């Protein structure tokens, strides 16, 4: 179906303990492929997928150089922002950056984005039109003005509508076995007493890829969000994912309740009664 | 592949 290539960047300052920690992570869809950590041994961008080790020395020298550049702009950004808000020299602050592109099922450009955060709230983001910036407060207005110097229009566009889509396409053929698979969720249902009048119905999905899945509760037609307890979709560690949803049931009525699972790996959407 | 241009904040 649709695909994505995303890079996530975290910078955290360490007042009186040196240079900020810097962490960069690459993803195609939900599969991680590269990493850099400013604390690790190598001081290089490192492979985290089988299919990307086949890139030559110049890729790795390239990516290493570019992420070292990324680290450096973030170092300066921590000091700029500490200046921008007049915060004291003695607190740890966080900068997160995320960019990349979405392609459709034809592998053509669909959407590009570049998000920025300071201390966990939105700082500046790139609008859909890829020329213009949403700035959060007065201090980000100065960054907006700076980044709306005339020449940037071209640069943004060039990466997100061009290079990002070029290389995501390259990666998707390079690991066809890894990235272009759909893994169907293995469905499963477990029932317990929890109150001797009440029963907990927990609905399961193990071993699926990609992570986007929808579990919802329903009693003989009309749906439920009131008694619904979703957990976060969680990695199994083998490259597939796991998720559960639960409802607190007036017991004796676990016949007229169906779990409903939607996944793109599913042919038909799965319906599970408790039997 | 990473983006080879970035501008300070």
């Amino acid at each position: 179906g649709s695909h994505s290539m995303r890079y996530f960047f975290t910078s955290v300052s360490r007042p009186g303990r040196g240079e900020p920690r810097f962490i960069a992570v690459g993803y195609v869809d939900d599969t991680q492929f590269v990493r850099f950590d400013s604390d690790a041994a190598s001081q290089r961008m490192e492979p985290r997928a089988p299919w990307i080790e086949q890139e030559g020395p110049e890729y790795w020298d390239g990516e290493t150089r570019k992420v070292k550049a990324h680290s450096q702009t973030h170092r300066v950004d921590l000091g700029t922002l500490r200046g921008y808000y007049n915060q004291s020299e003695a607190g740890s602050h966080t900068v997160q950056r995320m960019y990349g592109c979405d392609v459709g099922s034809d592998w053509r450009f669909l959407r590009g984005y570049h998000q920025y955060a300071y201390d966990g709230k939105d700082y500046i983001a790139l609008k859909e039109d890829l020329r213009s910036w949403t700035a959060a407060d007065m201090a980000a207005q100065t960054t907006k003005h700076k980044w709306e110097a005339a020449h940037v229009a071209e640069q943004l566009r060039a990466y997100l509508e061009g290079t990002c889509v070029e290389w995501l396409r390259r990666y998707l053929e390079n690991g066809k076995e890894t990235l272009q698979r759909t893994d169907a969720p293995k469905t499963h249902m477990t029932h317990h007493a929890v109150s001797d009048h009440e029963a907990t119905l927990r609905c399961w999905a193990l071993s699926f890829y990609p992570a986007e899945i929808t579990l919802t509760w329903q009693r003989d037609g009309e749906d439920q969000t009131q008694d619904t307890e979703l957990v976060e979709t969680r990695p199994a560690g083998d490259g597939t994912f796991q998720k559960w949803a639960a409802v607190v049931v007036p017991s004796g009525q676990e016949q007229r309740y169906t779990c409903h699972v939607q996944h793109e790996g599913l042919p038909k959407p799965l319906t599970l009664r408790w039997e | 592949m990473l983006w080879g241009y970035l501008q300070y904040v």
Partner: T-cell receptor
């Protein structure tokens, strides 16, 4: 706005002599390079500096010397002139991480002859 | 060798189209440039290109095909003052070296 400047345009030296070639840059660029250009080899990089205070060697660094004490100036020292350092020398400057048009701009050049 | 260029000297009459090809070898290259150099003078920048397709500025047209690793430059309707050597330049990023071709020497005959 005034761009990359470089003095002098022309120079004769005898073998042994030292000179420095000045280079300056109006535009707050972090990244400054020094090249030599020669009839059979094109542009060749001598030294370069990715920010103020820091510098490193290029493809042809031997015989040449460099410091970047301010972001504006990148002087090239030749501490003992050899006849094979007869060339055209071009200073050059580009933004680095500083933000601007990605373009590297060149200085007007210094034509140097080293004679025995 | 990193940037492969048209050796020269290429001879064109005035009014004609001069067409300079340039090939490079780093797959991850992201910024592409044309410089013009008059004999005795310094390389002056005339065209920057970043995305695939055509960019036109005046009588110049540069093209980019990242898929075949090729930067070109058409000079449409050649002036006498177009006589120079044209330097193809390629980079990967802010901190990556700017890789140069040897230059192709273009002569506009009157």
């Amino acid at each position: 706005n005034a761009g990359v400047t470089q003095t002098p345009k022309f120079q004769v030296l005898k073998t042994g002599q030292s000179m420095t070639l000045q280079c300056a840059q109006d535009m707050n660029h972090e990244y400054m390079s020094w090249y030599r250009q020669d009839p059979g080899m094109g542009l060749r990089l001598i030294h370069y500096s990715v920010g103020a205070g820091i510098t490193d060697q290029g493809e042809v660094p031997n015989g040449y010397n460099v410091s970047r004490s301010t972001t504006e100036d990148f002087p090239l020292r030749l501490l003992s002139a050899a006849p094979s350092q007869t060339s055209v020398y071009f200073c050059a400057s580009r933004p680095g991480l500083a933000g601007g048009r990605p373009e590297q701009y060149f200085g007007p050049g210094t034509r140097l002859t080293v004679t025995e | 060798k990193e940037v492969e260029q048209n050796s020269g000297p290429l001879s064109v009459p005035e009014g004609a189209i001069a067409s300079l090809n340039c090939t490079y070898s780093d797959r991850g290259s992201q910024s592409f440039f044309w410089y013009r150099q008059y004999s005795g003078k310094s390389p002056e920048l005339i065209m920057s290109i970043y995305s695939n397709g055509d960019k036109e500025d005046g009588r110049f047209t540069a093209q980019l095909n990242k898929a075949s690793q090729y930067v070109s430059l058409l000079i449409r309707d050649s002036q006498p003052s177009d006589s120079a050597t044209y330097l193809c330049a390629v980079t990967t990023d802010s901190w990556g070296k700017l890789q140069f071709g040897a230059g192709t020497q273009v002569v506009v005959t009157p």
